[PDB]
Structure formats: structure tokens, C-alpha cells
């Protein structure tokens, strides 16, 4: 029984909500050493996505498992303090309500883990993503899991007819249903394809219900507000989607929620590891990806999943979009909708105005 | 005293939502050529883009008036004959709530109309769209009467300095305020941004309050819905924007809602009148624009604006956008917000997973 | 009860098999215009795609009657013979098993045909292609009637939402099964992915099993050869895929078997009537869309569906995946698999060999 | 006298069939330096492409030799203990036949070898790719040696116009064929046009009978399967096809079959050893091209041949093409013939619904 | 209270105006080294772009300090004499009215300061550019902090509702004004539209007079000359534009004045620091970009802003539009107006011409 958890947040950033410094991951390192050292974790890798610092580790102490929760942290905290040494931006964003920013802070490390039984072999693909919500895999596993002309393993590999099923949470609602593919796609449809407020939170393989998939997400809290810059883990191979299948649910850089001020829709580009960071107008949204195997609680690896040439034109209309959709300036649909807005001055211009408007 | 009259309607097409029928626009003819001849109207000019037949009337009769709105009935009544007796798809489709088609039905012709006294010489330019709504002029205006980086007048012509101010009305409250520009853009911006609420009707010059453009638009009704395929009237040069600036504004084919199922995003594709037809996924959204010269109540022209090779790239590159725009299927941004798709099975699916949902 | 029959035939064209000549479709004319006057159809339209000629009727007598088909059979005769006076090439081809060309001769007119109940309106699309079989509408009807990225009615209108049945002939046994959509979309595609022996011939909705569809496609015959160069029957709108929807599924220029000497793989390219003759390479592919409104057995219309400018772009990858194909001269996937190449020499080939392969 | 031996084989990859961890070629490398320093082989170099690790080896000990062979297992034997250790996927894929993966397992490395006796100097450029199979080389060699539009020295070098003649064998019926240019490229071309069936294994001048190019290819065996993952030598230079003759057969990235499950058809991508990995949809299809100098059974080099500039348009049509094919879905041309695809269920579609088709 | 003073000045380039040798950044370092261990800077960062040898450095000493600048200059001086020592082309050009260099030399060092009380974060960009004028920062910095279609915070902000003012430099009457936007953009572009005439020296926030932004930009001399090759410092984030709506008002690769003899328009190219170097055509003008993030006077950073992905389309469009200015060889507006080129043959070919002219 081995539990993958990858656990994200933001504790500061270098110039801007730009880029994690590397000094920060070097103080988030010492505590994870320790908590290994001490066996809390049996193995770990460190990274970050545009202004979000990733820890990835392996242990077997379950899901939602306070111990690895709380040493995931005390790593955030020592590198959040780290950060405000350097005088870094928005220094322990995401760990401090009154932290030095504009954006929604305080509401904690956003994670994504899944507790499974290691097969033979484990290959899991780990997307981390800066800039958008967790609404932004809704299309991506759609295809993954459910999609004949993404994965074609559906219609051709006998381990895969069965299909797979979906947990859908309605984050306002806090309920969740389980709807399967094929024969409920279209219901699954109505509701995935508005990713502000059904979110797919685990995917599972019908035939024998095995946990295919997770995502970073929880209901909203009123403060509605919610997490963003969300993270993914993907079981692969042998009767679940293949590497090529999974990856190929990004090929197309899709419109996703966030960007600059968390109130735009941007294109999602798929980056290594070295351009995974946010610059023009604070994107445009970056797709990290990274391939291990995960062998008696130890992780093999990563191989950088999208720095490689087959994604060069997916990135390039990335660009190209991306350019397109600014020339909308604040209008939408480049612009979200009002409510969806993390930044707004409406309230009070509608209040200035109050007197003006004419019946 | 002059008024320009730009009355619209659905009323039946050929092979789906796809164009309007030639005999369906003689029966219309029949109906304005009397009318003029009984001294009601002055002059008009016929013609449709996508699924809605144009009727563009000049008269001494004023705005809103009976009896030119009676006589556009009419026109729209036979012309609906004609097409019931061709069966033509929605028959009638805007003049009865039980047409035989699946959109909203029954809400009447929309209208843009401007009451003036025509300068020396009166240059306009009228543009009507199908597939899309009212909002769908709200980046265009701005940009023609307030953004200097589209009418340099504004900038370098003296008598344009003061700027321009806009009445926009909130649709779903039903009043109107009134901002100028410069010094309120932010503000205008922060409300036109959302085309579904708070939409453009009227457009003043500032230093003598002159009638410089007008854009159908009504608030909602509750049956909250409201008239699509909108039309606009813009009054041209000499302190007002030249007919190029007003051309620029629509240079860029922005995304505007509406398009399949009046449940998408689509970019705003600028045609000719021989391309005025809507086909792929019900458009792209079309839009028609004539040039005319109003003259002692007369109507000089028109010139087809859009067709002409100044125009070729922007439509290129909405077709470009088109396809990127469907490769997101049922999910948004392609697909409208919830509470603004024409279509939707949202209401029935969760009641159907009414018991399926879990706390 | 109103019957839509839509059947061609090869009966000669000017310099190969590039073209139908207007002569030739003017002797058609009489024929048609001389059953009509004697009350056999109710009306019709004759044109081409390529070296085809189209006859599209409408009558009161059913599928497969013996006195339409002799109709269309006597009008390609007279056309037969216009086309062996002006000495054009395959004079009869379709008709006469010893016509002067080199492909297969003598297989008769292909048919489509669908006896309907007319709703209160009937809008339905026409499509005619050259230079290709039967199977290569497969990919397009899955998507009209079942891919929910082509066709958000599926999952945004109720009346669609019980989906549609499709009738998969082996056209090799004989023997045809239903299988819905969307529970049975793996099992579907694992065989409509295989075009040369599994096809689409007829498509129904779910809930009132109405006829929605139809394809010209027959089992083979052992002479294993069929006819090709397919036509197909879509009613639309109200609880149908909608007219572009419909199109939305032609908007890709999928690779389709035929082309040069019915032996390669090339791009559907959807044209307009002007541009439905087969040049390049003998193609590429063409594909020719008529839009039309059945009223009482009359045939309102048509308006030619893909000569639009939302297609161009269409048509400019067609010609650029008709260049990469061909720079792979004779070898697959340009090329067909043995089995299924209208010409070939292996047979000869081997047999010149046989004592020159060395076990 | 000098042999050339190129062995590949699957022994297990990180995070699916992506990539060969350096660790197991580590292990590999200590194999081969022990058979170097004992004298069984006298130089090496060891390399890999996608989950293809490669063992390039030169001796004296001619093709098809036991000890060499040995040699090689012994290699990837030891290489796949440590995949095995690492826990990557498909562990010792091609040597056991019940290694955890879904392809098919356990048929051995694949082998292109060439005993020859080196020439003043003796320029070689090696071929290694994944995701393809042996087929995939026909195209490319047939251009190199008998295509004047490819290499112009078949007519402007008097040292190469009497021509080549090519070994063409029927993996089927386990015989082959010898066929001279140029007077039978017609008959040739009919049958390497189908890369499944008959495969160039072998190429000569035909002056003086030099060999000049071997591939990796063995007749099937009904377990009707083979190998993948094909490699090829071939021989350069004076007389022999320049370096840039046999590049420029590689230029056009045409489609060969496999890319995902083995069920495809994709472009071929030629890439530098840094790029030599599959990702999207497990691919694009890989092209290592390494050149050498053979020198007393010596290796001198390599150089990376598809790492330069020349080839970046190569890879971006390669991506494009890509993309193309692959909105294909699970149709052909994209997906394979029925009989060719190495993942199928169809046996069990037919047998589920055998009593639904109807007569 | 921490100034921040980016100095540079051109002190000889490797072979020609080309770019800065090492070992003359390398004395430079020595000096600056020295000056911070004597306390007279408290940090500082040395670097180039073309041939502009850069001066990054903060301290207490506030703007315009003797001690500050006589630093910088002795820094200049120890880099020339090693230009000089090594034989670089315009050794110690901005230094000596002298030196070997055929261009506008000894003005003097370039400066852009800013004494400012360190917020809780202090992020800023530093931009720094070769071969252009100070104005070209006009069009940016009018984006950056008053165009709502760059900078949405201008909208969607409380924070930034109420705008920025622009301190605008009549560099040849050697006075400025103050003009605030929104409501006085119209004049405000009226005036900086002219980058020779008008310059934007400094911004402020509206609400609280904060300073945001410094240009380096002094009023002209007659010896009409001035410096060139301009550094700009923006503060960002917090109610200041985030460092992504900085970024993104240099997405588009604007025309400036300058490149090859400062004679010519071309376009501005955003570079990464590998790519700060002049060579088409002396340019295209390049701009360096840097993020830092200042904390108690430490420079923390840098970060390259445009050596990312994100610019890749920039980079592109600035190559293909230098390529279409240089079609137009020495004619305007590739080439500058008469008074503005630095380099001229005007004033001797109307001398030379003087007799030859007819009334
Ligand atoms: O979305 C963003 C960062 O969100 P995270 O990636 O940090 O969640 C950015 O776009 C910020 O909203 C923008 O820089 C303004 O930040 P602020 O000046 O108000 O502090
Ligand atoms: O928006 C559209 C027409 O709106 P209008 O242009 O007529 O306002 C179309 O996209 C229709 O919604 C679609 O054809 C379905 O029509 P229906 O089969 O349900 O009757
Ligand atoms: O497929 C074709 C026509 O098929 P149809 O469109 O007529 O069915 C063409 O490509 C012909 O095979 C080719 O011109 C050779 O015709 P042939 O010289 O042997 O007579
Ligand atoms: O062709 C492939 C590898 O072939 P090789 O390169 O290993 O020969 C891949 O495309 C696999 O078929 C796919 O990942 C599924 O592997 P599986 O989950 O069933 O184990
Ligand atoms: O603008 C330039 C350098 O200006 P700076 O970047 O040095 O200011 C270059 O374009 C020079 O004018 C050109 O090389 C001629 O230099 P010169 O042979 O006459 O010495
Ligand atoms: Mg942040
Ligand atoms: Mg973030
Ligand atoms: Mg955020
Ligand atoms: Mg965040
Ligand atoms: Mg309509
Ligand atoms: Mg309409
Ligand atoms: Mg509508
Ligand atoms: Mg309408
Ligand atoms: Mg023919
Ligand atoms: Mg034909
Ligand atoms: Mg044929
Ligand atoms: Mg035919
Ligand atoms: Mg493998
Ligand atoms: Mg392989
Ligand atoms: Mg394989
Ligand atoms: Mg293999
Ligand atoms: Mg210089
Ligand atoms: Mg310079
Ligand atoms: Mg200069
Ligand atoms: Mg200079």
C-alpha cells in the first residue's frame, strides 16, 4: 500500500507572482530530508510551476494523513520564511491571510494523493499547473478516460471496453456523483463543461473500480472562494490510459480560468521544466508534467513530460492564442464572467453610479 | 428631420437557420413598395444576413412609431406566408411563439432607430449581424468613440477632442446610465466588459450632445430572455469617426456569444452580402455591413463594406479562431455560461441525479 | 409520406474522368421533366459532382420502386447516349460492363432513398462525392450523430439527449446490426473505423426511431466489387443535428479511400458546385453539399452548402494533405492495402516471380 | 574483414514505453566492456531510441554469430534486471514473454548485421527507430538507391550508374527476391509499396555485387507476429550513396506504421539523440540517424546526423502531419488495417454481437 | 530609503557596435566591488545589451549623487582603458568626444533613477535597450500604466481605479508636464506620439503620488544632440501593474527610432541575455529585460523576463518586420526624417548642388 501525495503552495515569488526562488526549495529540501530521514516519507522530489512550490512525495501513511500533511507544512513555512528574508513577493502567500499581496491569500497548500497498491509495474504521469483552477482538467481527463479519439485503447484493447467513471464535485454544493462512460457522457458533459463548478475529483476504472485518477479540489468557503493552481496524479499503462494517451489529452493548449488576476481565460501551455514560468500578462497559464515509476514507496525518476519537440506547435498556438485573446482587452469571454472574477470593481462603481442609472 | 429605421425579424429559412429565401424578402418588397408609395416611408432598402430579413426604412415619422413599426409587421407577416407556403424552416420563427423551430420564438422585430437632422451631407454606416446578440457591438463602440488607437480623430482631429459618451443600459434592471470618455472608461469598461448585462444603446458626441450611433437593444423579459441577431446605425465623419475608423473597429473579429444553439463563443466574421449565410456549427457569427448616404430622407447606396480585400485576413483568421474555438467542444469558454445558453439540459440532468449526489 | 431519392450514375465525362458534360445532364433533363409531367416523381433536381451524375427526386412511391429506378435508369440511357455521340470518355461507364475506360464497369446507379412522414417543416442536406466509397461518410455521420464535440445538441437539447442508433452493414456477409450511442460507441467505432467492410447505411433517434439518415451502399458482389462515389441523405433540425452540425462533422477533410484509380487515401475537400470536378491526381476527393426544404414532395432549393468561406480553410489543408500524401507516390498509407485496390498488377507480378523467390 | 552489428531490444522504460533509463545501459555498457577487454568484440558504442536500448558493436566473428548474440543477451539481460529493480514498465519486454506490459512480449532483439571487408575508408551512417516496424525503411531505401531525384550520383556519377539491385523478402512465405534498377522498379515498387508484406532486407550494387545496406527484419511466426523497432546499416561514399544522399531519403517524414499500440500510422520524425524519446500519442514515430567511420573493426564517432538545422522543417511537418492524422480518431488510414493492428477488439466485438446481426 | 541607479554607457564594442567584450564588464566588477566594500553602493549587478555596458546598482545616496555617479564613470574608465588595451572598435566611445567610432561621441553616461521608500515587497523590472532612443519606452510605459486593454487592473482593481500621471519631457525646451489619465490621454498622446520631441521621464500613481516609473532621458544640447540606447525602471505589483501587464506592453515588437546608424525605424525585440547583441543591420534594436526584487538595498535576482517561450512570436514577428522595413532601403519611414538622422550627406550634396537647381 503506497500513497503518492503531492502537496503545492505558493510562499513567495521572485519579481512578481513570476517564479519559485530556488533558495526557497532549498529550505523546503532540509525538511523533507529530515521527515525521509526520520521515515515519515519514503522518498520525495522537489519542484515548483511558475509561483507554486511542489512537493512530490511517497510514504505509507495513507491519504489526508496529518503527519505528511504537517511536514508538508513546516516545508512551505521554512521556505515562506526564506522567501521574506529575500524580500520576496507575496512571501508566504498562500500560508498567511495578511501576507504581502493582492490576490486571495491564507487558504493553504492545495493536494492532490491517491492511496493504491503499487502493480507490478507503476508509471504515473504528475501534472502541476500555475495560473489557472482546478477546473482546468475537466477536458484533459474527459479525453483521457473517456474520449475514443483520444485514447483509442477504449475501442481497441480488450482491458479497456469496460470504460471508466467519473467523480464529479459540485464545489458549491459539496456533493459528489459518480457518472460512467460511456452511457452517461452526455449528462457528464452538461456538468464538466462548465469547470468554475463541476469538477472532476477522482476517475476509476469500472470493471474493477480501480483509482485511476485525482485532482486537486475541494468545495468552496465563504470568505465563495477557493484554491487555484491545481495538480494531478494519472496511473498509467497496462489497461489505463497509456503515457502517449495521457499526454495527448494536452495537445491541444485549451482555454482555461485564470491567467493575469485570476480573471481571464488563457490558452494552457505545456512547458519543461526550465519555461515553467509565468511572464507575458502572468502566463500565459503553464502545464508542467512529469513521468515516474513508483517502486516500493521510492520514486523513479521524473522524465520531463513536454520538453520535447511534439509539443513545440502545441506551445507555439499557445502564443498564438494567447495574442488573440488580449486583443479582447477587458471584455469577454477573455475576460470571466462577473462572479467569476478574482479581482472586481464593480461593486463599487455600481455604487458610484447608483444615482446615475435611470429607470 | 430625418429618422433611419433598421427593423429585423426572422421569419423562415431555407435548409435550417441557414438564409433567408428571396421570395420571403418580395413579399417583404411588395409591402415597403406601397408604403412608400402611400408617402409612409421615403425610402428602404431590403436585404438579410444569416436566417434575418433586413428592413431598412428612412421616414419623417420619428422613433418608435406606430405605423412604421405596423408597416414592418406587415412586411415580415407576408413574408412569413410566403415562407410557410415554401415550408421553410421556422416559419415565421420571430412573429410566433409556436413556429416550428427549437430556439426562442415569438419575440418580435429588433430595431435600432435614430431620429436627426441631417448635416450637409449624412454618411452612415449600418451593420447587422446574425448569430450573436445585442453585446456583441459593445468592443466595436468602444473602440470607434473612445479608444485612440483605433480613431486617432480623437487624438489629432480638433473636433473630436471632447470625446464621446455612452448610455448603457443594464438589460436585466432595465435602466441606463450615461459615461463619458475619456475620463469614465475605466468605469464604462468595468460595465461593457459583461455584453450579456450592460450593453451599448446609444452613442453621443460630448460637446453638443449629437446622436452618433444607435444599437438594438431591450431589456429582458421574463417568459429572462430577450431579441438576438442585433443591428446598428453609425453616423459618420466630420467630428464624427470617418467611415475607416469605424471600419477598423471591427478589423479584429472578436469573440461575441451566440453562434450554434445560441449557446457558444464564436469569433465575429465581417462578410459580404453574397457571404451572409451562416453554415458551419450554424456561422461562423456573420456580420453585414452597408454604407449609405441619407439625403432628404433618401437612401443613396448601398456600398457593401465588408467585401473587399482590406477584409480577407480577418476572415481568415476567424476561420483560424472557428476551428480552435470547436476543438473545446461542450466545454467553456466555447460554450456559454450556464445561466446564458439559449439551450441546456442542466435542469433536467440534475434532477435525474437528484439521489446520485453525495454529502 | 414523401420519398427523397437521390440516385447517380456514371454515364461518360469529357477529357477522362474529370467532368460531366452539361449535354449529357440537359438529355437527363427531358427524361425527368417528361416523368414529371406523367406525375411518376413530384419533382427533382439534376447536377454533378466529378464524372457523376445526380438525379435527386421526390415522389410518392417508396424506396427501391421499380418505376423511379427505371425513371433514372432510362434518363442516364439518354444521357449515355449524348455522352458516346460527343465521343466522351467512359461513355455508359456505370451502365455498360464493356464502356470504353478501364475501371469498373457495369455496377449500376448507387442509390439513397428515405420514405419519410414531412414534419411541419423538412430541411434536409444532400451530399455527393466523387472519387471515393461509401465508407468514407463513416467518420462524418458518427460525428453528426454521435460525437458530442461536433454536436452540442447531444448534450445541450433535450429532445437529443436519448441519442441516435446507427445501421452497420457487413458488406461483405450481408448482414447488418444497430448499435446505440452512446453505450455502444466502442463497439461502433471498432468497426466503422474499418470503411471498406463495415458502413454506415442508415441512422435513427433513439427515443421514436425516425429515419435520420441514409447512405448509397450496398453488399459486394462477386464479379469482391462494389459501387463507390457515395450520396447521403441527412433530415435536420428540431431534435436532428442541426444544418451545421451537420456541416460541423465536413469541416475536417478526413483521408478517404479512392482517389487516382480508386487505389489511394486523399482529403475529402468539400466544394461548391462550380468546383465539384476532379483535377489533381484526379481529385482530390470531392465532396458537394445541397441544402433543400421538401414541402408536399416539392424540392425547395437547393443552396449549395460549402461554397462559403467558412470552408476555406477547410479546402486549404485539403491541398496540403493532398501534396504531403502524394510525395509518397505508390506506397501505403497513400496507397491502398492489396485487397483493396481497384487496380493492380500483383496478381501478375508474383506470377512473374514465382521462380525467382528463394525459400 | 569487418562485421557491423546492430542488436536492439526492449528491456523495460521510465514512466511507460517512453524512454531507456541510463541505469540499464550503465549495466549494459559493463557487459560489453567485459566482452571488449576478452576480446569477443573490438569496439562498441551503446545508445538508445524511445524504450529501444541499442547495442552497435563491431568484430571479426561474421553475421549471425553465437558468441556476439550471447553477448548481446547477456547485455540486456543484465540491463533488465535493473529496469526490473527500478521498477520501470514493461521490464525485460523483449525478452520475456510474460513481462508486465501489454504488447506483445518476449520474440528477442532485433538484428541488422553486415560482414564486410572495409574499404580505404568505410563511412556508415546507422539507423535506430521506435514506434514502427521494419517496413518503415522500404520508402526511405528505395529513394537512396534507386531514386534519381533523391541521389542524383545514379546519373551524374559514372561510379554508380550501372545501379542497385535490392533483396526483397516476403515475411509471409519466409522467400525473397532479387529485383535490379533500374529496369524493375515498377515491379519493385508493387510490392515494397506494402511495408507489412514485403520488406527490403538487403541492398547491393549491382556492378560488383557490394553490399551496401542490411535492415533488421525476419520472416513472422504464428504465435502471424514479428518484431519492431527496426534498425538498418548503410554502407557510404564512393560509389556508394553520400552521406547526404541517404539523409535526404529521410527529408519527407512519411507515414510508416505503429505510433500508438501499434495500431497507427504517423509520420516518421527525424530526431537528435536528445529528442529520441515517444510522448505524444507515444510518438510521433523516432528516427535516430548516427554516422560513423569503421576503422579496423574500430568505431570512430559518432555524429548526431538529425541533430542540425536542416531537418527542423522535417520535424515541424512531422508535427503538423501528426496532428493531422490524429483528429482521425480510431479511423483508417489513421488506425491501421484490421489484420495489421498489433492491439484489437474486434474477435470479441463479433462474438458479443453475433446473434444482432441480422440477414 | 533606497535608490536604485541603472548607469550605462558604450565603452567600445568586439568588432564593431556589436557587443560588450567580457573583460571589460570584468574591470568594471573590480570597481563596483570596491565601491560596495568602501560602503558607497550596497549592492549592485553588471551586465550588457548590445554594446552598452550596464550599471545596475542601489544605495542610500539618493538620485543625481556625485559619488554615485563619479563611481559609475570610474567603473566606465577602467573598462575603456581594457577596450582599449585589447584594441575594441569605439573604445571609451561615451567617455571621449574622440574616440575611434564614427557615431555621437562623449555625451556621457545614460541614467534612470529612482529614490523610493522600499514597500513590504519591492519587485521591479529593469529595461534596458541598444540601439533605439528613450522615447521608444513611450508607447510601453502609455500601456503599462494607462491603456485598460495592457493593464486590466486599470479596471478590474480597486487599487489602480484611480490611474497613473506622466511626467512628459519637451526634451529640445527642457521643460515637462504633468498629464494625468485617464482624462487627459487624448493630449497626452497628442504628445508622446512624437518619441523625438516628447518623452515620458517619469510616472506616478494618481492616489497617492507614488513613484512608479523612471526613464533615462535628459533635455537635448547643442554641440540638436543627445544619448541614446535608453534604460527605464518600473515598479511593480500591489496597486502598481503586475509584472505581467509590465511584460505584456512589450508583446508587441514596436517600430523606435535608431538601429543601423541611428537613422532608421525598426523593430523593438525583447532578447534574453545570450541574445543581447547587436548584428543584422546593427540590431534589430534589442531589449533586455530583468526582474529583481530589492530588500534593504540587496539586489535580489536577476531573473530573465523575455528569455521564455512567451516571446517566442515577438521575437518572430520583430524578425520578419525588420526584414520588410529593410525593403525600403534608405526611403522613409525605414529611414529617419532629414533632422533626425545621426548620420546625414544632405547638408553636402545641396551645397554640391546649389548651381544645379532651377527656378
Ligand atoms: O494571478 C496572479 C497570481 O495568482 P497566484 O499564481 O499567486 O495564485 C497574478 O496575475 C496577480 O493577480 C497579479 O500579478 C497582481 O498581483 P497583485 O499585485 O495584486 O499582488
Ligand atoms: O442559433 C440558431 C438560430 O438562431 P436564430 O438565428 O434563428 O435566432 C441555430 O444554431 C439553432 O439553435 C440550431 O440550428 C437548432 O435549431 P433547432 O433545430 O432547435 O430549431
Ligand atoms: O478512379 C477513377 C475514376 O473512377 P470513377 O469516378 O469513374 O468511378 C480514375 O482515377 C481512373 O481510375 C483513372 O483516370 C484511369 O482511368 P482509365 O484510363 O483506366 O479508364
Ligand atoms: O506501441 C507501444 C510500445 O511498443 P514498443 O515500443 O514497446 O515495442 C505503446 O504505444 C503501447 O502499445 C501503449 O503504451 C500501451 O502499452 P500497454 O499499457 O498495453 O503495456
Ligand atoms: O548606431 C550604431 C551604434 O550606435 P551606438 O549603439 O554605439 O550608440 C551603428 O549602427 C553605427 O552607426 C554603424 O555601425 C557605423 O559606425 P561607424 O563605422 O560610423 O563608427
Ligand atoms: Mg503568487
Ligand atoms: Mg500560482
Ligand atoms: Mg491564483
Ligand atoms: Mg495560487
Ligand atoms: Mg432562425
Ligand atoms: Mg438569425
Ligand atoms: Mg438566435
Ligand atoms: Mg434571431
Ligand atoms: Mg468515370
Ligand atoms: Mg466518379
Ligand atoms: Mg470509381
Ligand atoms: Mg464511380
Ligand atoms: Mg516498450
Ligand atoms: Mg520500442
Ligand atoms: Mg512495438
Ligand atoms: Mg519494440
Ligand atoms: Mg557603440
Ligand atoms: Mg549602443
Ligand atoms: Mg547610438
Ligand atoms: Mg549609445
Given at each position: 500500500?503506497?500513497?503518492?501525495s503531492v502537496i503545492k503552495a505558493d510562499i513567495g515569488s521572485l519579481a512578481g507572482h513570476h517564479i519559485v526562488h530556488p533558495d526557497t526549495m532549498?529550505?523546503?529540501?532540509?525538511?523533507?530530508?529530515?521527515?525521509?530521514?526520520?521515515?515519515?516519507?519514503?522518498?520525495?522530489?522537489?519542484?515548483?510551476?511558475?509561483?507554486?512550490?511542489?512537493?512530490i512525495m511517497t510514504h505509507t501513511r495513507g491519504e489526508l494523513d496529518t503527519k505528511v500533511h504537517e511536514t508538508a507544512w513546516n516545508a512551505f513555512k521554512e521556505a515562506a520564511k526564506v522567501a521574506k528574508d529575500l524580500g520576496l513577493y507575496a512571501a508566504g502567500q498562500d500560508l498567511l491571510s495578511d501576507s504581502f499581496s493582492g490576490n486571495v491569500r491564507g487558504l493553504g497548500p492545495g493536494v492532490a494523493e491517491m492511496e493504491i497498491e503499487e502493480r507490478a509495474s507503476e508509471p504515473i504521469a504528475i501534472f502541476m499547473a500555475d495560473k489557472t483552477e482546478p477546473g482546468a482538467y475537466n477536458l484533459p481527463l474527459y479525453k483521457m478516460f473517456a474520449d475514443?479519439?483520444?485514447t483509442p485503447g477504449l475501442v481497441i484493447d480488450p482491458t479497456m471496453h469496460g470504460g471508466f467513471k467519473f467523480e464529479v464535485l459540485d464545489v458549491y454544493q459539496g456533493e459528489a456523483v459518480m457518472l460512467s462512460a460511456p452511457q452517461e457522457i452526455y449528462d457528464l458533459l452538461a456538468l464538466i463543461g462548465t469547470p468554475?463548478?463541476?469538477?472532476?475529483?477522482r476517475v476509476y476504472r469500472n470493471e474493477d473500480n480501480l483509482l485511476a485518477a485525482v485532482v486537486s479540489i475541494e468545495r468552496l468557503n465563504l470568505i465563495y472562494v477557493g484554491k487555484?493552481?491545481?495538480?494531478?496524479?494519472?496511473?498509467?499503462?497496462?489497461?489505463?490510459?497509456?503515457?502517449?494517451?495521457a499526454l495527448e489529452a494536452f495537445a491541444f493548449p485549451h482555454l482555461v480560468p485564470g491567467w493575469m488576476r485570476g480573471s481571464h481565460y488563457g490558452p494552457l501551455m505545456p512547458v519543461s521544466q526550465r519555461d515553467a514560468k509565468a511572464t507575458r500578462f502572468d502566463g500565459?497559464?503553464?502545464?508542467?508534467?512529469?513521468?515516474?515509476?513508483?517502486?516500493?514507496?521510492?520514486?523513479?525518476?521524473?522524465?520531463?513530460?513536454?520538453?520535447?519537440?511534439?509539443?513545440?506547435?502545441?506551445?507555439?498556438l499557445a502564443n498564438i492564442v494567447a495574442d488573440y485573446m488580449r486583443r479582447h482587452g477587458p471584455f469577454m469571454p477573455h475576460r470571466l464572467e462577473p462572479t467569476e472574477m478574482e479581482?472586481?470593481?464593480?461593486?463599487?462603481?455600481?455604487?458610484?453610479?447608483?444615482?446615475?442609472?435611470?429607470?
Open positions: 500500500k503506497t500513497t503518492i532549498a529550505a523546503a529540501n532540509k525538511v523533507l530530508a529530515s521527515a525521509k530521514e526520520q521515515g515519515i516519507i519514503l522518498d520525495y522530489y522537489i519542484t515548483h510551476v511558475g509561483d507554486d512550490l511542489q512537493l475514443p479519439f483520444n468554475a463548478r463541476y469538477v472532476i475529483r487555484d493552481d491545481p495538480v494531478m496524479i494519472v496511473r498509467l499503462q497496462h489497461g489505463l490510459p497509456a503515457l502517449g494517451e500565459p497559464p503553464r502545464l508542467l508534467g512529469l513521468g515516474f515509476n513508483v517502486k516500493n514507496g521510492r520514486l523513479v525518476g521524473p522524465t520531463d513530460l513536454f520538453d520535447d519537440p511534439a509539443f513545440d506547435e502545441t506551445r507555439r479581482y472586481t470593481t464593480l461593486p463599487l462603481i455600481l455604487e458610484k453610479l447608483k444615482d446615475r442609472f435611470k429607470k
